[PDB]
Symmetry: C5
Subunit: 359 residues, 5 copies
């Protein structure tokens, strides 16, 4: 019983199998269970709001036809070069750019057929998928990125898509992302589509990504803090009269503006204010207030110069103010900073915890 004779006999010009007609025509819709395996996730672009994923799509549906029932083995592994002579369902991705196939030495495709007629179609695909991420809290956030699968040409009374009950979404073992930590929530929902042409089936899968704060802390939170420390200690424990104290402030402001521009470099332009903007704005406000304080001290010194020639009675009165302000500044500034840091870190921790619970 040669393989070739049977092979053609099933889907040949002698067989009545038309590949342009859906199975069970004029009948109940063809149910399709979809299984996805993630081979290599990664390369998430924050600029143009998209990520790259290489999946192994797997879809099964039941055909009354192609149930040979005359062979010792129930499952037959067929050629992937005769995949044009069967009824593949139409499937497209809604948030999709590009999405090439792969042709290395052979087409990366798979066909299997059981005795009853259940088929197994497996396709390797790299997808560039659009994720409209919300950057309300930039360094610490959970981002949800969407994969949607729809039928382009078939209305709801044909080709209903369903998920797989067990192991709908899998991940390759030892798969890591440099920037994000993937979570195991693996949310799945059915989100039907309505158009003027008709109503079309859809199923979607949701992934939760948390952002590591390790890079961001080292890159920005540490340098900005160190420059605040530098300004604080450096000028106040210097003599009242000096060009250096003044110059220090200007240079510190220059560093702050360069770092502020540097932070908002990779990020796409957005209307709302991110957390990192709040932090850098507060640090800039601290150094600006510090330079203003020194300018005020200089004015008090100017008053002393005018007084110098009941002369000494006024002199000390102003000078003592000079000293009092200088000491209060020394003890006042760090405590206020400490207070800011605590009420900032606490609230952000509460927001991120609430966000993960909400999602």
């Amino acid at each position: 019983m040669p393989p070739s004779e049977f092979l053609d006999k099933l889907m040949g010009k002698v067989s009545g199998y038309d590949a342009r007609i859906r199975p069970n025509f004029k009948g109940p819709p063809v149910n399709v269970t979809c299984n996805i395996f993630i081979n290599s996730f990664g390369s998430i672009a924050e600029t143009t709001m998209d990520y790259r994923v290489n999946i192994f799509l797997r879809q099964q549906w039941n055909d009354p036809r192609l149930a040979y029932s005359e062979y010792p083995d129930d499952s037959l592994d067929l050629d992937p070069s005769m995949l044009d002579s069967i009824w593949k369902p139409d499937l497209f991705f809604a948030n999709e750019k590009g999405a090439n196939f792969h042709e290395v030495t052979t087409d990366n495709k798979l066909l299997r057929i059981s005795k009853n007629g259940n088929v197994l179609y497996s396709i390797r695909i790299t997808l560039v998928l659009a994720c409209p991420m919300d950057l309300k809290n930039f360094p610490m956030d959970v981002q949800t990125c969407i994969m949607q699968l729809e039928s382009f040409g078939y209305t709801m009374n044909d080709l209903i898509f369903e998920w797989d009950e067990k192991g709908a979404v899998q991940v390759a073992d030892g798969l890591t992302l440099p920037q994000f930590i993937l979570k195991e929530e693996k949310d799945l929902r059915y989100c039907t589509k309505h158009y003027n042409t008709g109503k079309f089936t859809c199923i979607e899968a949701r992934f939760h990504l948390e952002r590591q704060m390790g890079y961001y802390l080292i890159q920005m939170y540490i340098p900005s803090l160190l420059i605040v420390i530098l300004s604080w200690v450096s000028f106040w424990i210097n003599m009242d009269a000096a060009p250096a104290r003044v110059g220090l402030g200007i240079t510190t402001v220059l560093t702050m503006t360069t770092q502020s521009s540097g932070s908002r470099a990779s990020l796409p332009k957005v209307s709302y204010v991110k957390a990192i903007d709040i932090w850098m704005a507060v640090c800039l406000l601290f150094v600006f207030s510090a330079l203003l304080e020194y300018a005020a001290v200089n004015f008090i010194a100017r008053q002393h110069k005018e007084l110098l020639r009941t002369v000494e009675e006024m002199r000390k009165l102003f000078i003592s103010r000079a000293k009092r302000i200088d000491t209060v500044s020394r003890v006042a500034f760090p405590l206020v900073f400490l207070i800011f840091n605590i009420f900032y870190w606490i609230t952000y921790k509460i927001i991120r915890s609430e966000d993960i619970h909400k999602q």
Copy 2:
């Protein structure tokens, strides 16, 4: 009544359907109604003057042929692999670069045919479209971007394009742009094309985009203002004789030139002057005038040095000028700035309001 027999019978070698001849040949022009659905707008490049759009083109026309009239159901959903055996009309985009199709698991295409002969052709297309935007007012403006559809090979007495009376342009729900706000004007006009070869049909669609000022305000209007504030308060409330006061001005000018270069970084080179250029030029003029004022004060001080050895009569005469100028400067500069800001913001608000009314 098997599907295959009829299916071929309509558009087969036994049928007299030639796909190279227009329907109703030697007759009135084939009218075509066009419906467009916008799946995902975005990614607008200001440099090379273009934007990206992913649409769902839909065009309907009437064929006397293909009106079977022998089936229980009026509408038949046919295969998208037999779309080469019918009379699709020619259609191209005038301001177009690229414009690939999509081939993911199947071609993303749709064919429908009613009992009378009205067809429905639906195509998924990503377009890179050229928009010749006018940057007269850079941060606040309304930009109109053009989509034009034309018949390449058919003159006006064939294949007249028309718009759809109801729901000509739709937008996918919850579609947002990071940089712009789309408006609901959805202007539609017919803009016929004349060539030496002949006169060709065209229809166009206009989109109005407003620019959010949230990013621009934070990125440039706030830092420049803060550096003006810094210069103003810092030097004048310092003693007349100091190297610091001089140095401050030079560094402030350095910041202004770097920010001015930074502003005109993404923008393409254009002859006309943008609003942001006016703002940065005025701020640069303020700090330049401030440094000139300090230089003049130094010259008055030089006069005092020459006088120092009717000697004291001249001395005070110049010194009082020194004081008078210093105080007037303190009160003079902010009010003039305030006046500038009001007459700048008011006029730009009037221009943008006029522009939206005009469009």
Copy 3:
């Protein structure tokens, strides 16, 4: 008289039309008139010396065959899917990179055939074309960019290319370039090609582009001038003894070097010296000479310090020199700058005027 029968009958297996043999074989060369319409010019890259153009090529030639002479209408608009069964001439572009076609909903192609046999072939093409621009005068210049069309496979006694007598080159109405102004010279020449294999026909078209000076003036000529003004007025109207005067020069030099590097940023590396290099070099020379002058003043002051303890006789002798140099510098520097600006702007104006007359 059905369309299909005739349609095939002309260029069918029953017709003796071989599409691999040139018309009028063993005869006079096939003359071809070429008409070009420019749909969208632009995107000129100065780095890799090329520009992008989207044209509508149109070529006409006479075929003795395909002159049916039996139809009421002289001109027939045929399908663009049967363009493989005729004798298209070979045509390629010599300074060409890439040059894709366009396939949106249909091929963008056109076929027309008259009663005598004159055909009309219209093709939409985007060309990346190499322009070896000469940057001798960078901000103000006229650049000539070349389009060449040649026959790859046919020697001069076949397929002679000719231009069209009227309307050889057209431009779409309201077509503008952000950087350049297109001129209406529209030069056309025939520039035959000689090879060892044979002698091949060619025709070329020349476009003249002038550069707007509006962006360049604002970006570089104004900031550099303002920094020269700043240095000039700032240090000389300050007291002889100061750290500030010295520091000012160094910072001004830093600005000059950064701007000089910034100017030569987009530009490709070239051996010859551009006009902008001359301007920035002269401005750098002015500030360098200014700092040297201050250093000399300091040395004269050093002489006074040595003299201070016929002592006063020497003292004033040197001091008066100090004053004399300071005043002459004040009046000397701007006039010399003014002279430089006039003899620079005048000569460049003469060169550009001569260049346009020459071209």
Copy 4:
């Protein structure tokens, strides 16, 4: 005995050779030996974690069919245009992006067939392969990059992949990399794949790459060291009272922050701390501690100013501290730096030596 007759006769419609059925069907799995030749390795991207390689894949397997046994010469070199009429095995790369073929003048392919039936299939391929490199030790490290080959459609009882016993991996003579030194370990392992669909064969090859420290040393280790040297010697051998000493520190800090940002520029964002970060952090700590020391000296000087009007008894007591600290600083700082450098270089040398031994 004409070539054509035999040529077709072997794999023709008269032959029973079906190219869709595996050789030795219903039998032991088809064993495949794989030989790889590396034509041009290189272009390793640290950002998106991948490298480029151009290989010569070679795979041999035994076919009972195609053993003609009637020719004088055992080995026949066949055409590479009839490679569609045989049973090529499926093969794909797991960590693969892209992987085009090459079509220059002909397809770059090879077919050979021996008398017994052993075939030789040779394919030229450029692979972009994903390497998840570990940057724990950035300048000095050994990186292992993975190539994996798998059967997409065939389970373990078909198409078992095996390596070649002799010369499995070769390298073209005189092949060098600008950044890395390739090692000759050439590790080979079999790393079978398990899926829910089935169990699939795989074989992998490991390459060891060491990083040259020549560029990194010159680019970063030398400038940072020179700036530490500059700060150290420059300020301490200057008078106690000066604006210059203060300013020096701020500028040195500015250089350190710019260099620190410059170092972490090419590198992708990662949570863990690299060796270069440790080095730059320690150098920044040294200059920060130096500026703090100067600030403390200024405070001691302030005490002297307060004392100046048992007055002189206190004065010297503080002044001597000033001198003592200044001298100890002079001798203290370099030795501590020397100690740091030795314990840093030694430990990194031990870690890299351990790593190469482990791998």
Copy 5:
């Protein structure tokens, strides 16, 4: 004698011409002479070590078949659409990335056939070719870039490649490169390839490129020199006691480090030290030594301060040293620089002259 009948008759199903069998089968190897014309060289990337070239490949070989010998004209220009029905030889480029063809309006291809059977095959190709350039001497060097042509599928007793005796390599008239000057050496060698599969023919062509020093001199050699001049003259002709003199050095060092980083920006990372690195290192050493000298002068001044209250006997002794060092520095530094420049320019001139003679 119609063209079509003969045309097919030569290479038709009635002719015994099999296009899968080499001419003169079981015979001496098919000799192939190769002629290359360079249409447009250029776009040489120093980063990823490659260049772009657009060539006109021409190869001739002798076929016993296709020698009609019955026509008045010896040479026939055939269609380039029947190039699939002949025996083209296999040819690939070893150092090749990409290498597309060109399809503009027609395939850019040529076929000619003489009476004896000598064919002429002409192909237009753009090649991206890998050149492993040696950057030992960066601004002045001669670089040799390699083109290699090999037979992928045929061993040495078939398809031997040979060069053309006259005019093997040509260049289009008036072809210029912005960065390099092409030389006329046009070296040609045969460099056979050995593999385990077999021994394969190869022929190679060598191009010599010299680098213009005009851009590099202006961009780096002039600014660095000017900044050395600035430092030299500026500080030494200033009073011994000043904050300005100190600050000058730090700023000059900042310029040197920025320029040094700027130089090594386009260049790929390499272990060895380039000439430009030597030059910038020496200039940095000069300014570093200058600042150290000023620091030493300050220490001598400190000694004078300690002495000031046999007191005056010590005072002058140190002061005279101060003066002596200051003058020697003034005359010492430029001569040493002059010596460096001469022994640097001379040796590099000798090395480049030796290199061109060697090549």
